[PDB]
């Protein structure tokens, strides 16, 4: 009814420990969600065009041309790690657990409140807010996944990460098909590169509406909505990283001479000439057996063209890579391709008291060593006459195409049947948790944006809207915009995310890396004197595991 609550606030994470080292981690997340009535009650097909920016030669990477259907609905998205765990919970998970499973998801809307705003004609602004007890909130659960999948974490538009801070839903929109051509150029190109937007292909048109595709529930102040429990079928997520490169696979060479005194200058020596050694190599025309030429079971990681942009029907897009750059751990400035960069606002980890539109940014460096150091790569002749001469070796400094800033590694691909790689680690708090699998016939082996992928399906998107609150002067025949009473809603969203995790075991004599609070990061986890909070990112795959 009007004066009866329809739900309870719960934001507790429970760790129920099972037998055999397994734990059920049920994270509860409760938020107060504020929603305004849509700017327009219609669906719009809006073409965003920034040909001015890309008309500058060399700016083709800044292309934003696209077409989107803007809908009157808003999306309630909780597909981010920060929506579910605080730094203490994440510390417990990443320190005491070795693998993580995604078990189930539930969400519900309760304690719906709808208020109308009456603004007076007095010259200084003044307004009052009245409860509209008969107003309704339109809630649609796309449990069949009919609507396009538009996760908000990629735009930093999920629910807020603070239980005590009210959050908002994101206005929903989806991509409409378009055709676009953009010939790349550079500073110094003469003429106007081909840069046109060709329109839309009629055979690819797909105009979706929530009304025609999903059942819609009208919730009054005394109503509540529950989606029901959804159960995932994803793969386990490892909370351990691998450190072994191809150089550290298998049996090391026997050292016939060992150091007689400790110290950094004292080295063990194999004691056998490199061309007189025993072993197996894939180089059938050389007698040298070294750490770089000896046979290994397979290849850890792969090389791909980095900062390569491929053009397709809808324009250019960067070629993704599964693994981050090698050497970003020895030198943090080397983080670039494959090291995801997260930019977020005050709702999602940035200092809440900051002013301005500049977001808080961080580049994530994974502990796994599956990356590549292209500056140390090279190609050489099949003859393999050592030491190699100039014409028989292609080095990373050799120009490709006549460009001194482009080398073969930029266009180099080593993906093959022997490539072995890991899934992307969870990124806390701004990383996505689960992502829908592509509906293609042949599917990618992994996604670079979420550690869990939906093989069959994952829970339907939740859409909310303020039902039209018409005045007495509504005329559907009029071409002017619908006249509505200014209405807004505040409702409580509660979600339950259930994981299954395995407790880690100590395999080595030495201790391992753990996340800990210290003097440097001590104040990143507590509020300031005025209430300013923040959530800094945390690494997940802290403990190491042996690859081979």
């Amino acid at each position, epitope marked *: 009814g009007v004066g009866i609550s329809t739900g309870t606030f719960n934001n507790q994470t429970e760790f129920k420990f099972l037998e055999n080292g397994w734990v059920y981690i049920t994270a509860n997340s409760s938020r107060l969600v504020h929603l305004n009535m849509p700017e327009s009650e219609n669906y719009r097909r809006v073409v965003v065009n920034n040909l001015d920016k890309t008309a500058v030669n060399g700016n083709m990477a800044l292309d934003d041309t696209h077409a989107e259907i803007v809908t009157p609905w808003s999306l309630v998205d909780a597909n981010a790690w920060g929506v579910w765990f605080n730094p203490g919970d994440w510390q417990l998970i990443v320190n005491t657990m070795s693998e993580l499973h995604l078990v189930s998801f539930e969400q519900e809307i309760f304690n719906v409140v709808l208020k109308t705003v009456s603004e007076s004609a007095t010259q200084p602004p003044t307004k009052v807010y009245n409860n509209d007890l008969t107003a309704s909130l339109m809630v649609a659960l796309d449990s069949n996944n009919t609507m396009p999948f538009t996760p908000a974490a990629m735009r930093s538009e999920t629910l807020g990460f603070y239980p005590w801070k009210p959050t908002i839903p994101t206005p929903w929109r989806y991509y409409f098909q378009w055709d676009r051509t953009l010939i790349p150029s550079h500073t110094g190109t003469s003429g106007t590169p081909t840069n046109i937007y060709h329109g839309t292909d009629p055979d690819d048109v797909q105009f979706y509406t929530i009304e025609n595709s999903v059942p819609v529930h009208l919730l009054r102040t005394g109503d509540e909505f529950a989606t029901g429990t959804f159960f995932f079928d994803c793969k386990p997520c490892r909370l351990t990283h691998t450190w072994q490169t191809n150089r550290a696979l298998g049996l090391p060479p026997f050292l016939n001479s060992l150091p007689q005194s400790e110290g950094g200058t004292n080295f063990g020596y194999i004691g056998v000439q490199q061309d007189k050694r025993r072993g197996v190599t894939q180089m059938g025309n050389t007698n040298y057996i070294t750490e770089a030429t000896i046979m290994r079971p397979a290849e850890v990681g792969y090389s791909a063209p980095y900062y390569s942009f491929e053009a397709s029907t809808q324009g250019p897009f960067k070629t993704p890579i599964a693994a981050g750059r090698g050497g970003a751990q020895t*030198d*943090e*400035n080397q983080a670039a391709d494959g090291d995801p960069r997260y930019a977020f606002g005050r709702q999602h980890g940035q200092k809440t008291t900051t002013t301005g539109e500049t977001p808080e940014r961080f580049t994530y460096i994974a502990h796994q060593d599956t990356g590549r150091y292209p500056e140390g790569d090279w190609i050489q002749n099949i003859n393999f006459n050592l030491p190699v001469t100039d014409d028989n070796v292609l*080095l990373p*400094t050799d*120009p490709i195409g006549g*460009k*001194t*800033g482009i080398n073969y590694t930029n266009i180099f691909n080593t993906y093959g049947p022997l490539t072995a790689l890991n899934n992307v680690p969870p990124v806390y708090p701004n990383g996505q948790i689960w992502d829908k699998e592509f509906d293609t016939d042949l599917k990618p082996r992994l996604h670079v944006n979420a550690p869990f992928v939906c093989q069959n399906n994952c829970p339907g998107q939740l859409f909310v809207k303020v039902a039209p609150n018409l005045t007495n002067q509504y005329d559907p025949d009029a071409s002017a915009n619908m006249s509505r009473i200014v209405t807004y809603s505040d409702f409580w969203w509660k979600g339950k995310l259930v994981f299954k995790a395995k407790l880690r075991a100590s395999h080595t004599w030495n201790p391992i890396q753990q996340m800990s609070i210290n003097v440097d990061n001590q104040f990143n986890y507590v509020p300031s004197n005025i209430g300013g909070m923040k959530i800094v990112y945390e690494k997940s795959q802290l403990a190491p595991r042996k690859l081979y």
Partner: antibody
Amino acid sequence: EVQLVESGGDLVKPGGSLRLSCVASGFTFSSYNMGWVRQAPGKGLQWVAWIYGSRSSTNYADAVKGRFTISRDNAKNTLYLQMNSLRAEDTAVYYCARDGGSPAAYYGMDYWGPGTSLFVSS
Amino acid sequence: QTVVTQEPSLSVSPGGTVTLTCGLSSGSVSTSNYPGWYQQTLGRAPRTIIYRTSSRPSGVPNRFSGSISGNKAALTITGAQPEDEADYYCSLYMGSYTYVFGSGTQLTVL
């Protein structure tokens, strides 16, 4: 945009010490390898010191090894060159140098400061 | 010790083409040396003309071109202007993290 300003150059007797300070602006200081070059009065440019990497690894020319120390403070966006046991041969204009390639270094001085003169004389 | 040799002095008429060369007494210069060319005027700090043997910083006129000729680095000025008269210094990346500088070439526009 990218600006480097050197200071601390002054007349000093042989065998003394002096710290040149280089203030950088218009760019992320910690993301670029920095260095100190020097030009003797009427002579050509000579590389003095280089600081590179997120670990602040340092390399020095043979003429200043053991005597010069190159360091950086990214909080202040400052580059420090501390010279000890200064000689008359160290008298010159010292230029701040910034490499423009953060993830792929140019291995060359992209930006230069106005320079600070250091005179070593008894 | 590494020694970089370049022409002590060079001359070019206005609107002409001149080439300054930078070699090594022992060895050859390649793109692995990342040859850099810097311009210095009287009483002013050096200005970067070329980096990575081909790249001129934004604002550098197109009349300056960097290349690798033979076993040396070459800086070619085509249509040389009066303001191009200055001392041009060549920097070679000598591996590891060591840099070497040439003696310098005094280019005067007649």
